[PDB]
């Protein structure tokens, strides 16, 4: 059923959830409410692969087992003037080295 996701673009991350039966188009409709960019001006990716707007998240691979609230799956987001931009996701800072006591 429920699938939990991080929708990521550059330095922006959306925490949202959907149903495994939800479509990709339903996902872009979520993006529009929060980011005010219409669905046709959107591209969504799982890893380096573009997602067909009419598929369910399930048929894209987002299972409940793999998209948990404590470990959400990542969806990449690219925006469209005439050209669609390249998918680009800025990484989080890296953790410091573990102190010796804790190693």
């Amino acid at each position: 059923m429920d699938v939990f996701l991080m929708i990521r673009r550059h330095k922006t991350t959306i925490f949202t959830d959907a149903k495994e039966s939800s479509t990709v188009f339903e996902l872009k409709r979520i993006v529009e409410g929060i980011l005010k960019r219409p669905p046709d001006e959107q591209r969504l990716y799982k890893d380096d692969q573009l997602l067909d707007d009419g598929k369910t998240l399930g048929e894209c691979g987002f299972t409940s087992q793999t998209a948990r609230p404590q470990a959400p799956a990542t969806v990449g987001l690219a925006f469209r003037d005439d050209t669609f931009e390249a998918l680009c996701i800025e990484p989080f800072s890296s953790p410091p080295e573990l102190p010796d006591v804790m190693k």
Binding site: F15, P69, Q70, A71, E90, S93, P95
Partner: protein, 88 residues
């Protein structure tokens, strides 16, 4: 207003449901603009905090078996201080 934006110290923005952000007692005081700037919490810590907001809201009840919340040893010192700063 259904969502709020939380910004880490290295400039990452996290958009989460406003109801979710309220699990933090510190955030609930300020919110109860729609953005909060954490100028001492980095993104590797703040992202994990947001995952906890999700997990906490999903798993308040116990009609589902509550799974474990994995925390890498490397963030746990900083995550502790963040969790204590945000009161969650």
């Amino acid at each position: 207003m259904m969502y709020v934006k939380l910004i880490s110290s290295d400039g990452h923005e996290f958009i989460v449901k406003r109801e979710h952000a309220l699990t933090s007692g510190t955030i609930k005081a300020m919110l109860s603009t729609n953005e909060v700037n954490f100028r001492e919490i980095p993104s590797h810590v703040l992202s994990k905090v947001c995952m906890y907001f999700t997990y906490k809201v999903r798993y308040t009840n116990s009609s589902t078996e509550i799974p474990e919340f994995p925390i890498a040893p490397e963030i746990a010192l900083e995550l502790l201080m963040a969790a204590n700063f945000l009161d969650c």
